Amino acid sequence: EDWDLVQTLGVQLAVNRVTEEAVAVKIVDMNIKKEICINKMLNHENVVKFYGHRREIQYLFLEYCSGGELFDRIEPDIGMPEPDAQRFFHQLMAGVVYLHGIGITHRDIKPENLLLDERDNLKISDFGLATVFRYNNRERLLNKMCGTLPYVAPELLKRREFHAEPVDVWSCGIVLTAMLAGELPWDQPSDSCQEYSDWKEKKTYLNPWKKIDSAPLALLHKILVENPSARITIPDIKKDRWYNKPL
């Protein structure tokens, strides 16, 4: 059936000639084989749906999110109301639990890859950098460096191998920091970085931590933990106090 390419989104918005259903089409001219492979395993309300692909230049048919990206809900230097931040983080955690549940790591979690549907539901998007980190119940450590510097965990910069799961968790905390303060805390989690050094020294009277409430800030203290082995895990995030706070 015929789809009209209405407009460019980033990827183009497509509308069905008969049903008028909307979808998004990723157009890549020749990573991609794996993107498709991974997309074929994914079925979750907090992950962008994969409809299919055509090998004409390659076409990926992906759920369309009229809400836009999460960054457009963050007023620079301000953030967003705490109740919206929490809801998005709840949904972000649901998405991430699912992926890790079937052994997949996104590896590039950031507001540019968190989309919103019409009810403002968050959808994890773009599995171009994603990889399988558990297969046949065996975990594989990662050694390739992927992601975006401000959202990347510190072990990815100093260690030759690392666990996939705590990396995604760190990035979710960076995203949470952004949702509540409108800014990113550091350019990268390296010790040459004054800002990351200040955090490691508990100077939370500076931004972005000054703008964050003590309850959500206590959770960030647990996520932005340099030792990936001491870093909080997702099941324990779900028991955190701000996480379960009525807002």
Residue 9 assigned as binding residue: yes
Q: Give me the helix-helix angle, 214-223 and 164-181, nearest 10°.
A: 150
Annotated catalytic residue, options 29, 72, 108, 120: 108
Among 3, 38, 46, 69, binds ligand ZYW (CB under 6 A): 69
Query: Which residue's CB atom is positioned nearest to ligand ZYW?
Result: 10
Among 3, 50, 61, 64, binds ligand ZYW (CB under 6 A): 64
Cα–Cα dist 91/50, whole Å: 19
Give the number of other Cβ atoms within 10 Å of residue 75's Cβ: 9
Residue 26 assigned as binding residue: yes
Among 6, 21, 68, 214, binds ligand ZYW (CB under 6 A): 68
Q: Which is nearer to ligand ZYW, 48 or 74 (CB)?
A: 48
Q: Residue 108 catalytic?
A: yes
Q: Which is nearer to ligand ZYW, 61 or 133 (CB)?
A: 61
Q: Which is nearer to ligand ZYW, 10 or 83 (CB)?
A: 10
Residue 10 assigned as binding residue: yes
Output DSSP code: residue 90: H
Q: Is there a contact between 93 and 46 (Cβ–Cβ < 8 Å)?
A: no
Give the number of other Cβ atoms within 10 Å of residue 118's Cβ: 9
Cα–Cα dist 32/58, whole Å: 9
Distance from the Cα of residue 128 to its chain's centroid: 13
Q: Is residue 84 part of the contact set for ligand ZYW (CB under 6 A)?
A: no
Extract the tokens encoding 106.
């996104």
End-to-end CA distance of the chain: 45
Among 65, 130, 142, 223, binds ligand ZYW (CB under 6 A): 65
Q: Which residues bind ligand ZYW (CB under 6 A)?
A: 9-11, 24, 48, 62-65, 68-69, 112, 115, 125
